[PDB]
Amino acid sequence: LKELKILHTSDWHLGVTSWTSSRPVDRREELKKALDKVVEEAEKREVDLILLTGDLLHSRNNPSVVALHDLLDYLKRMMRTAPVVVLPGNHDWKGLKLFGNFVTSISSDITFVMSFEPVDVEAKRGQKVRILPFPYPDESEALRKNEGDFRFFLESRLNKLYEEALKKEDFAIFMGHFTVEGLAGYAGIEQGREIIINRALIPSVVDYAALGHIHSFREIQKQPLTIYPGSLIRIDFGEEADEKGAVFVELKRGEPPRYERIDASPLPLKTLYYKKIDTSALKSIRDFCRNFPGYVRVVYEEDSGILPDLMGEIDNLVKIE
Amino acid sequence: IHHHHHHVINLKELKILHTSDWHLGVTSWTSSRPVDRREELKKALDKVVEEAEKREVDLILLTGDLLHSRNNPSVVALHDLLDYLKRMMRTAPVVVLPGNHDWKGLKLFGNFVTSISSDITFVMSFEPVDVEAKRGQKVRILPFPYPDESEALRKNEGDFRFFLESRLNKLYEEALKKEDFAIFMGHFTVEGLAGYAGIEQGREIIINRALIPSVVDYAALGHIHSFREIQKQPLTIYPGSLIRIDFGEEADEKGAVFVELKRGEPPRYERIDASPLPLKTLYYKKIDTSALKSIRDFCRNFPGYVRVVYEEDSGILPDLMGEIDNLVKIE
Ligand SMILES: CC(C)CN1C(=O)/C(=C/c2ccc(O)cc2)SC1=S
Numbered sequence: 001l002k003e004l005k006i007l008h009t010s011d012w013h014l015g016v017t018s019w020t021s022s023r024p025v026d027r028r029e030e031l032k033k034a035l036d037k038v039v040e041e042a043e044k045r046e047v048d049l050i051l052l053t054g055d056l057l058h059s060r061n062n063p064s065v066v067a068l069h070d071l072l073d074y075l076k077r078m079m080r081t082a083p084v085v086v087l088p089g090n091h092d093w094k095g096l097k098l099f100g101n102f103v104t105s106i107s108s109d110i111t112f113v114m115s116f117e118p119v120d121v122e123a124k125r126g127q128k129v130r131i132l133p134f135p136y137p138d139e140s141e142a143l144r145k146n147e148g149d150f151r152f153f154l155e156s157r158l159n160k161l162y163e164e165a166l167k168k169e170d171f172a173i174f175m176g177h178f179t180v181e182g183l184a185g186y187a188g189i190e191q192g193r194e195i196i197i198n199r200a201l202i203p204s205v206v207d208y209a210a211l212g213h214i215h216s217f218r219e220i221q222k223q224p225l226t227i228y229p230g231s232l233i234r235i236d237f238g239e240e241a242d243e244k245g246a247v248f249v250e251l252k253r254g255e256p257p258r259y260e261r262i263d264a265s266p267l268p269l270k271t272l273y274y275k276k277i278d279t280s281a282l283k284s285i286r287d288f289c290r291n292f293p294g295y296v297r298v299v300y301e302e303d304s305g306i307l308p309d310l311m312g313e314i315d316n317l318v319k320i321e
Numbered sequence: 322i323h324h325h326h327h328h329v330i331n332l333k334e335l336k337i338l339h340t341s342d343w344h345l346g347v348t349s350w351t352s353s354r355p356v357d358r359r360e361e362l363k364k365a366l367d368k369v370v371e372e373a374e375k376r377e378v379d380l381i382l383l384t385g386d387l388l389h390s391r392n393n394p395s396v397v398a399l400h401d402l403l404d405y406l407k408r409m410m411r412t413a414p415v416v417v418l419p420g421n422h423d424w425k426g427l428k429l430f431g432n433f434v435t436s437i438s439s440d441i442t443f444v445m446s447f448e449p450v451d452v453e454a455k456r457g458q459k460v461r462i463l464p465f466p467y468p469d470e471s472e473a474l475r476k477n478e479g480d481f482r483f484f485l486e487s488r489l490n491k492l493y494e495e496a497l498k499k500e501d502f503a504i505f506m507g508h509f510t511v512e513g514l515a516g517y518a519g520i521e522q523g524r525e526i527i528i529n530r531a532l533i534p535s536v537v538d539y540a541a542l543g544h545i546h547s548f549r550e551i552q553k554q555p556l557t558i559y560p561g562s563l564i565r566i567d568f569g570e571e572a573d574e575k576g577a578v579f580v581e582l583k584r585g586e587p588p589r590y591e592r593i594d595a596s597p598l599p600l601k602t603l604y605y606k607k608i609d610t611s612a613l614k615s616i617r618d619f620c621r622n623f624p625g626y627v628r629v630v631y632e633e634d635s636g637i638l639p640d641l642m643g644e645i646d647n648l649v650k651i652e
């Protein structure tokens with residue numbers, strides 16, 4: 001047709017345990033609840049295509065059974081709503097590509113793009129969609145990397161995708177797993193680290209660019225619409241002010257693309273700032289934590305001598321800096 | 322035109338292909354002269370696939386060790402497995418009873434793949450599952466996979482035997498609730514193995530053939546390298562491997578099994594010969610003048626692999642392995 005409704009979510013980080021150094025907190029229950037809201041909104045808005053990018057699994061090379069089980073489960077829940085296109089992150093298990101290709105071959109409701117080669121998928125209402133994938137470069141690239149030709153290598157493939165995008169029928173969607181050049185704020189870096197790609201190098205002829213790997217929601221540009229949806233939960237206190245969720249994108253053949261943020265409303269984070277820890281502050285911390293339904297961080301400047309076991313008496317206090 | 326299952330009214334027939342113990346990724350005789358069996362194994366597998374398409378089987382059963390390495394299969398072995406898995410699925414619906422693997426993620430992937438496809442089913446528990454055959458026949462699978470802890474630490478004695486028996490009785494009762502056909506799938510060693518070879522061996526699950534539910538139309542077994550017609554009622558068959566893995570399988574005949582089922586008539590079956598490379602063991606007291614002439618003459622135009630067995634050394638042995646590419650083992 002001439003219309004395409006898309007749900008784009010990324011960076012689920014299934015299996016994550018936060019603040020393992022100070023107070024380990026399994027985010028599974030919170031994550032699943034947020035993950036459920038995204039699924040419900042997919043069915044409610046009746047999306048035609050679902051895009052998955054970023055780190056769906058927290059552990060790159062050692063995911064737990066439970067984490068893997070949650071992944072496959074939510075993959076299936078997504079598939080029952082609309083056809084799914086997945087751009088996996090970088091995993092060194094070379095058998096993963098075999099699995100992805102196998103699953104892609106046996107189901108018409110899911111596609112795993114694990115190369116730079118474009119793939120023509122079919123949306124829920126029959127819309128033809130050309131996927132332009134740009135995953136983390138294999139080696140290949142890290143082997144022939146000299147900083148100079150490596151940048152030229154990336155541009156070549158980006159130019160190749162541009163040429164392939166011109167061959168589109170109905171819609172063309174770009175999917176990339178990298179960090180856009182010019183990010184000073186998260187920017188969790190690096191050092192390192194992942195591949196840096198400039199905005200203008202993204203094929204302008206695509207209808208939408210689906211990005212991942214970033215915890216925080218970022219609207220990179222409008223033409224073409226380039227978006228990091230962000231994670232579904234607040235992984236750490238750097239994301240305290242962030243709003244977490246997924247992205248609903250709608251496309252028309254002639255009209256400009258529009259999008260909305262789908263709030264997952266995960267648990268809130270709070271950082272309390274003190275000059276020093278004294279009697280008044282000690283009571284202030286205990287009082288706030290008992291009334292706060294989220295997780296709390298406490299940072300203070302001046303040394304306050306011996307500190308009472310706060311991370312042993314306050315289940316809500318997860319970090320002291 | 323279409324590529325989905327047919328639906329025939331009042332159809333009381335079921336054509337089955339049963340193959341087992343592929344051992345993909347295997348390299349033989351790594352201690353004397355390593356030989357990659359991949360090309361030979363793939364050649365046999367293609368023959369089995371073509372025989373499925375030719376006979377237009379309604380269902381495909383896979384048992385035993387499709388992968389040689391239980392805990393660390395290579396990328397190439399995994400690729401071949403998934404490839405041939407896809408080839409079977411194009412022909413007819415597939416039911417897989419996997420041998421116990423060390424990895425714990427296999428259960429998740431198997432269940433995931435099963436949930437998203439209607440042309441492949443992974444049975445990895447004792448629970449029965451109803452599957453649909455190529456022409457719409459309802460088939461109830463009664464799976465008997467390798468037990469789990471349980472076996473470790475096997476505590477204790479006959480309590481484990483009563484556990485196995487209880488499970489088998491459960492499968493029997495569920496087999497009685499069949500709609501059309503019922504098929505037993507098991508990964509164990511039948512008591513009274515007569516006789517090749519017993520090894521394996523190795524810490525195995527032994528079950529008498531009488532304990533296998535008699536109300537099933539066919540009992541698909543695996544894990545044994547040699548073809549075995551255990552019994553005729555219910556028809557119980559180890560298909561055997563597709564290649565001769567070691568010299569204990571020299572007199573073996575390797576292949577798969579085609580089974581045809583009818584409501585009123587007893588089951589008939591034909592062996593699908595894979596025709597793999599032959600093996601041969603050469604016996605000598607000591608490798609002397611006569612023995613050298615015998616070995617060289619035989620290996621000359623023998624299309625398979627040869628093992629030479631002798632008892633005592635007698636002078637420096639000539640470079641027979643470098644001279645004879647057929648000779649893979651002089652122990
Ligand atoms: C095969 C896909 C349907 C789901 N999926 C996995 O199962 C993955 C498994 C995985 C990834 C990394 C690793 O070290 C072990 C397993 S990644 C991914 S996407």
Ligand SMILES: CC(C)CN1C(=O)/C(=C/c2ccc(O)cc2)SC1=S
Pocket residue numbers: 095387388391392393394399402419422424427430431434443
């Ligand atoms: C469930 C199917 C995809 C077939 N299949 C595998 O992919 C398997 C993968 C595997 C097995 C053991 C291992 O150490 C790593 C991967 S086993 C098996 S049967």
Ligand SMILES: [Mn+2]
Pocket residue numbers: 054055089177212213214
């Ligand atoms: Mn990432």
Ligand SMILES: [Mn+2]
Pocket residue numbers: 011013054055213214215
């Ligand atoms: Mn991430």
Ligand SMILES: [Mn+2]
Pocket residue numbers: 385386420508543544545
């Ligand atoms: Mn076995």
Ligand SMILES: [Mn+2]
Pocket residue numbers: 342385386544545546
């Ligand atoms: Mn075997």
